[PDB]
Amino acid sequence: LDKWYKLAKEKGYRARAAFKLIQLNKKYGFLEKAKVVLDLCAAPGSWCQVCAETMPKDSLIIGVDLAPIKPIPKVITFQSDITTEKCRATIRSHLKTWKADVVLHDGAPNVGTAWVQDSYNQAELALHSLKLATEF
Amino acid sequence: AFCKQLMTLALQVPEKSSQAILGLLQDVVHTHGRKVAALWNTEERKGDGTYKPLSETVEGSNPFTTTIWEGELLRKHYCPKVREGLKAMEKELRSI
Amino acid sequence: IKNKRAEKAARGISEEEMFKVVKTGKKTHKKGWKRIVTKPTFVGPDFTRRPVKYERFIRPMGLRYKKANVTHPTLNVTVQLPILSVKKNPSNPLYTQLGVLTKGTIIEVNVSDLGIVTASGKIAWGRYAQITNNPENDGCVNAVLLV
Amino acid sequence: MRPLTDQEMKIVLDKLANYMTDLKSLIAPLEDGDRYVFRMQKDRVYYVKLSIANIATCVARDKLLSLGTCLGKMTKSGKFRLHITALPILAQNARYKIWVKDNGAQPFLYGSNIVKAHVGRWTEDCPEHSGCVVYNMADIPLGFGVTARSTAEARRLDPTGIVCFRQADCGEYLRDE
Amino acid sequence: RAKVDFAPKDRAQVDAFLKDLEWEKTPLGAYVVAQRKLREERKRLMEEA
Amino acid sequence: YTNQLLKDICAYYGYNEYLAEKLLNLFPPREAFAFFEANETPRPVVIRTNTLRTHRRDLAQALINRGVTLEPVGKWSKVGLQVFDSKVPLGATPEYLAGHYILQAASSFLPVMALCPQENERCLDMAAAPGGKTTHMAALMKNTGVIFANDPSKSRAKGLIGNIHRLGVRNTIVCNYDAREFPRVIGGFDRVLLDAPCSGTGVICKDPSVKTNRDAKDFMQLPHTQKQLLLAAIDSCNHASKTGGYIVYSTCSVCVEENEEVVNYALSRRPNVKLVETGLPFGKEGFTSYMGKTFHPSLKLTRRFYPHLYNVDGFFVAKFKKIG
RNA sequence: GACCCUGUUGAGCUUGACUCUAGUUUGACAUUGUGAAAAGACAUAGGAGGUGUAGAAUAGGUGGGAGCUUCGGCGCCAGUGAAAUACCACUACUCCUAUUGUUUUUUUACUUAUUCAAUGUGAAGACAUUGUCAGGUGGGGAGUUCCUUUAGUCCCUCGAAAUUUGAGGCUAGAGGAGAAAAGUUACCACAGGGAUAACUGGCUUGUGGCGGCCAAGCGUUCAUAGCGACGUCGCUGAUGUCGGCUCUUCCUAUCAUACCGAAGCAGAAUUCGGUAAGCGUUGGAUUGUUCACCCACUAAUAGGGAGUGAGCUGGACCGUCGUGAGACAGGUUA
């Protein structure tokens, strides 16, 4: 059931991932003073929603995600993946010269293959997120 | 209601009394802040009614429909402690 | 008619959810406080605050209809027209107020696409139609224009 | 349109005394000399200026619809019921005040009673069944109602418990559109 | 008075107000001159007396 | 040829032969094609801030937090906002239910802006059915004075009554009178505002029914009622008041027989009335001579509005001053 | 549970006569003068005027029309435009100058109008107050018991309009004991009364409904009082107290294994259908649940039953105070 997921379904958000991000923001405040936000794996209607609320509205919100999630309005959401260099250049053309102040990534691999294959695929996707974060 | 009237009374009172009243209104801004900040901002002035100076009730003067302009006449008052009083008071108006 | 529609395109919360929110503000209730209307309905606007006398009658969103298959007796065509209002349910007067669609119920449909030229050269925009099927049993509304 | 009688004005002011404090402020002459009066039109009480009510005489009885601010209606049994159109008058001199959060304001506007988890601020020393006016956290008046328990009694409440029965909320304006 | 846009940190029309406006325009200034000419009218009459 | 262009517009857009002849006549052919494009495009939705309850940026900042995209509608109005996107419905907002704003049209702002209702006056609104005009009169009047708002229908008077109570107006008298009946029954008003019923040619996107259902008979019936409606506005207003005694004639029509001939009729049936400057920032001057029907040369002060010049419905504001 | 009714209540609709009038309110006038500064409408003598579109052009408009002629510039035939230009007859207004003038109003000035106070004149001031008409409303006071629709005459007035309209009239049907209260509702809340005292059992399955056309027949005699099939034409991610486990036996509505028929079925792999229950018929991930999808193993990972299957596992009565609304370490009970 999850109490935070039930709170989202009642009034809060689309999912409980938004509650995770405001807990990170409460732990350390970085979304209040930044200007550019780039999410490498956009959670559906939850992570972009709390990014829309705390941050200044409509200020370079990049929503690249390999999963074809619903496009959140007032958030520039892309349905293409992140590991390819062509998608990196597409990200470059959309940010012009403004590099990302805060970079976010949601690691959601196909868990279930004896917890070792899933852990490496999670870790490989996390290192690929670090490559684009170190780039921008 | 009292903030407007104390500003009015500070105009026509002796030098030591006017300096004391500006000290009192200085404490109100620091303590209450957002409650009386709209009085000095003329764009946040209410339009529900008009300001009644000569009123027999605190509630019926409609104090939020007026603007405070006695600071124009009191940055020019001969005693500079009165002048220093405003510059301290307007300092916490900008500090809100 | 479809071609003009294609050219033109080229150019809140539910009553069920509202009843759940209000129930949190209450306590041990009378058994069967809500009266779910089983019969298919037409409501019109998206969000309205009903009178207290009609607030128990919940019409669920999955049981609503906005368009009807309406046949013209003289032109011998059937077109899908939007429903404007429910005018007369000949079974229950409360069903008229709640908007229940029943066999024999008069509804008002938009005839703007049909291009009916009335007297004095005016294009008709709202006409009476009698529901000639049982929308409880089939998932559609079928009507014949009273022209 | 007629003014109230002795029996009608006792009932009207009894309902206003449950919710407000300075009732003599309402019946008080202002700077121009005119007063606020009470008028009855089609079993409905209107709180209007006397100068307005004097120049509304020329409207025919069947042809007059509203006058100033409507307080409520007097029912067939003789009781007087307050409506949400009286809320700006009630909020001006509210005796007891309750503030609800953003998660409690939206249920109140749908028609729910205030729950303990919805309250953001109470008023100290409130009796059990007293007339309270409901605000949000931005000091926006939302409606009025009757408290369920005392403030001391409701501080110990289980947070699904009722702390104020709803009587009128400003979602009634959506009803008449 | 009702048009000026005084702010705690923006005072432009407040400083100007009625800078390009004469001494005599106000009804105080209009009527006080009437006694000022009446004062010299009185000063001439006692001087003549 | 023009007759070929006449038949093409009648078939492509679904216009009647009578109405499209009229609309093609008043614009040049480049200006005409822009007008017919703007008619099928919905106007932007706008919001009027209630001065009696709040001011604009505090309302604007509040609706930012609920998920609404706003931008003020130009420099001409210090009050209106424009809505682009919104998650929360605008009519279900707690600020809306508290009386902080009313959904209106941008063209509705102009007649109350052209008139200048001041404090402690007695005003009349001769067609006040939705209530956007009257609540704007009271906001400028700071809930002082008297406003006589009337309707000719009971049904649309109920929505007006609710808007008055929601916005907290408290200085209005709602009556159910014909506009012609009014000077006999009350009279003596400092200001009168006339939003006369008309063809609705300025509002096509909101009302697509008038695209075809307007004939030559309809354009004899409506200007005749409006001519009697405008003469009633003159007799209601007093010539000599302590403040200004002014009259505003307003309509949402584009057709010349509905706005410019009626103001010429009033200037020829009452010599004691004069046309004055509207005070509106933007607009286009009224037509002086149309098709062999010369008007008074003072009609140039009158302003017109079009949905292709600006995102504002087809409108017409005429402001009058009474002398004797 | 649900259905019907009664009482109280709420929400809503309707009725609550007519004539004067207190009150309240709108317009016009009068008291009431004498000066100063302005404005407007009436009075002239003049001067100057007209840019929606298109048309070469900035077309007040009307009637003649076809050179008086310093120009044959300019008219005529040509467009374009509701309207066409050379030339002389007309008033309809708009912007300015001046005097040979009438009235109405605004601002201001002074007291004779007016008001207040006193006895055996002081103060205010051309504003109030007051008076007369024409109206509006009148749930208050005193007396008695108007409009809408319908059908006809095309019989008569006011307003608008480039020749067509809107608003009323005539005839006689229908709509709207009297401020005490009354009438009314498949609506709501509470309390009560009535009826029924759970349901289904040769049940269910693969092919929608409406409307038109066709239609063998039948019918009250029969292709028409009408009923009327097959066709054809026209319109059209769910979810979430739900799941998991359970031996044996049976059904076939067969996933596999066996055998047939058909398919561009070349071979390989198959697809669709038939006879078949002899023999077999897993596990992950998937917000927590079921799945639907997606993955691996496998010959294959079929669905069901043991009259509304069967087992283990993850409340209703009174009493008190209220009621625009609930509460009670109050009582009792299966």
TrEMBL record, chain A:
Where do the Ribosomal RNA methyltransferase FtsJ domain residues begin and end? 13-136
Instruction: Tell me which family the UniProt entry assigns to this protein.
Output: Belongs to the class I-like SAM-binding methyltransferase superfamily. RNA methyltransferase RlmE family. SPB1 subfamily.
Q: What name goes with this protein?
A: Uncharacterized protein
> Which cell locations does it reside in?
Nucleus, Nucleolus
Q: Which residues bind S-adenosyl-L-methionine?
A: G45, W47, D65, D81, D106
UniProtKB/TrEMBL annotation, chain D:
One example GO MF annotation: RNA binding
List the keywords (alphabetical): Nucleus, Ribosome biogenesis, RNA-binding
The organism is Chaetomium thermophilum (strain DSM 1495 / CBS 144.50 / IMI 039719) (Thermochaetoides thermophila)
Q: Could you give the subunit structure recorded for this chain?
A: Interacts with pre-ribosome complex.
Q: Which GO terms describe its cellular component?
A: nucleolus
One GO BP annotation is: assembly of large subunit precursor of preribosome
Tell me, what does this protein do in biology?
A: Required for proper 27S pre-rRNA processing and 60S ribosome subunit assembly.
What is the name listed in the Swiss-Prot or TrEMBL entry for this protein? Answer: 60S ribosome subunit biogenesis protein NIP7
From TrEMBL, chain E:
Origin, by domain of life? Answer: Eukaryota
- Compartments reported by the entry: Nucleus
Name the family the entry cites: Belongs to the NOC2 family.
Q: What is this protein called?
A: Putative NOC2 family protein
| Shown chain mapped onto the complete sequence | 691 to 739 of 788
UniProtKB/TrEMBL annotation, chain F:
Location of the active site: C252
Q: Write out the annotated subcellular location.
A: Nucleus, Nucleolus
- Where does the record place the SAM-dependent MTase RsmB/NOP-type domain? 35-323
- Provide the binding site for S-adenosyl-L-methionine: A127, A128, A129, P130, G131, G132, K133, D151, D178, D195
What family does this chain come from, according to its entry?
Answer: Belongs to the class I-like SAM-binding methyltransferase superfamily. RsmB/NOP family.
Listed name of the protein: Nucleolar protein 2
Source organism per entry reads Chaetomium thermophilum (strain DSM 1495 / CBS 144.50 / IMI 039719) (Thermochaetoides thermophila)
Residues of the whole record sequence present: 262 to 585 of 751
